[PDB]
Amino acid sequence: VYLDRKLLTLEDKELGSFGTVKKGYYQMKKVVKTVAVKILKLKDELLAEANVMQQLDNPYIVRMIGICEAESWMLVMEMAELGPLNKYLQQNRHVKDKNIIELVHQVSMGMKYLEESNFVHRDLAARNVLLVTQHYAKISDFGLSKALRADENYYKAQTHKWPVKWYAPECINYYKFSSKSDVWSFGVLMWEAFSYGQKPYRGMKGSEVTAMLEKGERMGCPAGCPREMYDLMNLCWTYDVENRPGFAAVELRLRNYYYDVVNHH
Numbered sequence: 001v002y003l004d005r006k007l008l009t010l011e012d013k014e015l016g017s018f019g020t021v022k023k024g025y026y027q028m029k030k031v032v033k034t035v036a037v038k039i040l041k042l043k044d045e046l047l048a049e050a051n052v053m054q055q056l057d058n059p060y061i062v063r064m065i066g067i068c069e070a071e072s073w074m075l076v077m078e079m080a081e082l083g084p085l086n087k088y089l090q091q092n093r094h095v096k097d098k099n100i101i102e103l104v105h106q107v108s109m110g111m112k113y114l115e116e117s118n119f120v121h122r123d124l125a126a127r128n129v130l131l132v133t134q135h136y137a138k139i140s141d142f143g144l145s146k147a148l149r150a151d152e153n154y155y156k157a158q159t160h161k162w163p164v165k166w167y168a169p170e171c172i173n174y175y176k177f178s179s180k181s182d183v184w185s186f187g188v189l190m191w192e193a194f195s196y197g198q199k200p201y202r203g204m205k206g207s208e209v210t211a212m213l214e215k216g217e218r219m220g221c222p223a224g225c226p227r228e229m230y231d232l233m234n235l236c237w238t239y240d241v242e243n244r245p246g247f248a249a250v251e252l253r254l255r256n257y258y259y260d261v262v263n264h265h
C-alpha cells in the first residue's frame with residue numbers, strides 16, 4: 001500500500017488542478033510504470049479514497065498502485081493516457097455512435113461490479129470516466145465512495161459539495177445513496193456521452209433542475225442518439241428508487257444493443 005518515494009518521479013506540469021493531478025513514473029520490480037498521481041498539497045478523505053480503490057479489482061475501474069506520504073499526500077494510480085471522457089468527446093466530435101455505446105457499456109460493466117461489491121460511487125459523471133484508449137473506459141474519482149453496511153442497501157449522508165445535476169431525487173430529498181442512485185447518475189452520464197461532453201441541464205440552477213424533475217420532465221434526446229439509448233437514459237431516470245433498474249439490468253440492455261449495433265455494422 002505504502003510506496004517508496006525514491007521510486008516515484010513526478011512531471012513538473014500538471015494535468016488538472018482538492019489538489020492536482022500529475023503524470024509520473026513508478027520504478028517497479030523490472031518495468032517502469034506510467035502513473036497518474038492525485039496530489040493533495042482532506043488527508044482522511046484521500047486515505048478513505050485509497051482504501052476503497054485497494055478493494056476494487058475490475059478492468060473498467062482505475063487501479064490504484066498505492067499511496068505515498070511526501071511533501072504532500074499522494075494517491076498513485078495506473079495511467080489512463082487519454083484523460084476525462086467529457087473533454088475527449090468535446091475535442092473529438094467525430095467519434096462514432098457505436099464507439100459511444102461501446103464506452104458507456106464499459107462504464108455499465110464497471111458499475112455492475114461496484115453494485116455486486118456493495119460500493120456506492122456517489123460521483124458518477126463523464127468528467128470521472130477516464131480513457132485508456134478511444135475504445136477502453138475506466139471509472140475514477142472514488143473520493144465520495146462508500147462501502148455499504150452489511151445490513152443496509154444505502155448510505156445516509158449526515159448533512160447535505162454535491163454535483164446536484166447528477167443526483168437522484170432520493171439523494172436530494174432523503175440524503176440516501178444507493179447503487180440505484182448511481183444508476184440515475186449513469187443516465188446523466190449517458191446523456192453527457194451522447195451529447196459529446198456537453199454539460200447536462202444547461203443554464204439551469206440546481207433548484208430549477210429539482211423543479212423540472214418534480215414536474216416529470218427529463219432532458220431531451222441528444223442529436224444522433226439512437227432511440228434505444230434514449231429509452232435507457234429515461235429508464236435510469238425513474239423517479240421511484242424501487243422501480244428504477246439496477247446495474248445488472250442496465251448493463252444487459254447496453255450489452256445486447258451494443259452487439260446488435262456491432263453485427264449490423
Ligand SMILES: CNC(=O)c1nn(C)c2ccc(Nc3nccc(-n4cc(N[C@@H]5CCNC5)c(C)n4)n3)cc12
Pocket residue numbers: 015016017021036038062077078079080081082083084127128129130140141142
Ligand atoms: C482534471 N484533469 C484530468 O484529470 C486530466 N487531464 N488530462 C489531460 C488527463 C490525462 C490523463 C489523465 N489520466 C488519469 N489516469 C488515471 C487516473 C486519473 N485521475 C484523474 C482524477 N481526477 C480527475 C478530476 C475529475 N476526474 C478526473 C483521478 C482521481 N484519477 N487520471 C487525467 C487527465
